[PDB]
Amino acid sequence: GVPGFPLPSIHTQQAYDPQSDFTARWTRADALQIKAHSDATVAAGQNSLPAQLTMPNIPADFPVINPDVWVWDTWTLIDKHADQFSYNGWEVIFCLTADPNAGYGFDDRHVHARIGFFYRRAGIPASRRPVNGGWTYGGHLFPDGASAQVYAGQTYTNQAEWSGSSRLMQIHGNTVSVFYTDVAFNRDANANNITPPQAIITQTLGRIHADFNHVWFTGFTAHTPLLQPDGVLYQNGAQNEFFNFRDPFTFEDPKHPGVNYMVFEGNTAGQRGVANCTEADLGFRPNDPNAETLQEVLDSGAYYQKANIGLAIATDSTLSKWKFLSPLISANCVNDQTERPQVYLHNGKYYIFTISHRTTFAAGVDGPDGVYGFVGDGIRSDFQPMNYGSGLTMGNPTDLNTAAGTDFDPSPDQNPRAFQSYSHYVMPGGLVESFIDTVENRRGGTLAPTVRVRIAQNASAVDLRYGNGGLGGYGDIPANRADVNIAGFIQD
């Protein structure tokens, strides 16, 4: 109830059938709360965010995970409940990787990304390992031809492997199903698409292995298209050449064993630039003195920002086949990007976490790059945005009062840590891993210090007593469960 700003929308948190068609809305009313709690008295380049929603500062002299590989979106090996498993004594993490010494600049790595994996010994406290994580690099995760099979006999200039998840299919076996986003591009000489990009959510099954020294994989030769945008629940390339569709995360319905769901980044279907946002996407409470009109918001171009978090359900046991369901959350007229959705269980509630960019917010809505959060009573809920009704869980240190800039061209009046990290993922215990983007005109293609957020109902707070003032050591992505498979172990 903050002076001069609209009240946040009302959200019940009530569960709905996941098969139903109810979509929660991260409304303008909700999102505007961010600038409502942003301290407007700060000096140029100081953090205007509320201190408990700010991520600790990353040091300029951070280490690198590996001097020979660029590393960003990073996940690890999880079961159907998102618990993180070591395998026969090893921790493993899967990364979008790229090559520093090939021709291209950090910012153009994306059309080049390859999934790689790192490993290190399990069961060891972070204070006892190298400053840079101790991660030894295993190489590419997939055999070289294999991800491009999805686009065999189509024409493109670039085909890359974008992020997703790795699921331990057998809690004490070795089958892993990697879900990832198999993208293709057809760029002209100025990097413009002559033809709209393709993103296809893809499964590949493979087996993990480990001896005493060394981790490795087998399989990953079969890459099965699972989902691609249909242009009716999820926006496609024909509709918007800049459409988002990626970041598959799967899980077993906790209240229903056997049934599997997946959550992924999307956009609200339809042709780009259609000005079809509704009073519901604005979500103001009746007679609020500070509400905006639908006509104002439209006139301002906000209808260009049309993110959703999508849902799909596996149509059998193998996770090789899936049906789209109505989106879980839309952010029409609020933000174009809700990346890396995950459902997360805590205290018998359901949390959707997703990350976003300051510069994908719609006109007149404003917030940091970082992690945004929603709570409810089920998989499909009338989700309540976290903290002051805003959705903000943990932003990079940002002055919201001054211009944002970019991770390659910083504005002088903005904070040098606005782009310190991205791709935050919330691990059991509320531990948050992420990659370093920009710290004081130092680009990091590398893992950021793991950090912690205590989560309490519809609110959160960064734990300033985690590790070292909140900073928990670089690349710390720890396993809370152990897969001890003696029989595949002796099969080396």
From Swiss-Prot:
EC number(s) on file: 2.4.1.10
Gene Ontology molecular functions: levansucrase activity
pH dependence: Optimum pH is 5.0.
Induction data: Constitutively expressed.
Activity control: Strongly inhibited by Hg(2+) and slightly activated by Co(2+). Not inhibited by the metal ion chelator EDTA, suggesting that this enzyme does not need a metal cofactor.
UniProt superkingdom: Bacteria
Catalytic activity reported: [6)-beta-D-fructofuranosyl-(2->](n) alpha-D-glucopyranoside + sucrose = [6)-beta-D-fructofuranosyl-(2->](n+1) alpha-D-glucopyranoside + D-glucose
Active site (catalytic residues): 73 (nucleophile), 339 (proton donor/acceptor)
PTM section of the record: The N-terminus is blocked. The N-terminal Gln is cyclized to a pyroglutamic acid.
Function: Catalyzes the synthesis of levan, a fructose polymer, by transferring the fructosyl moiety from sucrose to a growing acceptor molecule. Also displays sucrose hydrolase activity. In vitro, catalyzes transfructosylation from sucrose to a variety of acceptors including water (sucrose hydrolysis), glucose (exchange reaction), fructan (polymerase reaction) and sucrose (oligofructoside synthesis). Levansucrase of G.diazotrophicus SRT4, unlike the enzyme of B.subtilis, causes accumulation of large quantities of tri- and tetrasaccharides but small quantities of high-molecular-mass levan.
Protein name (Swiss-Prot/TrEMBL): Levansucrase
Organism: Gluconacetobacter diazotrophicus (Acetobacter diazotrophicus)
Gene: lsdA
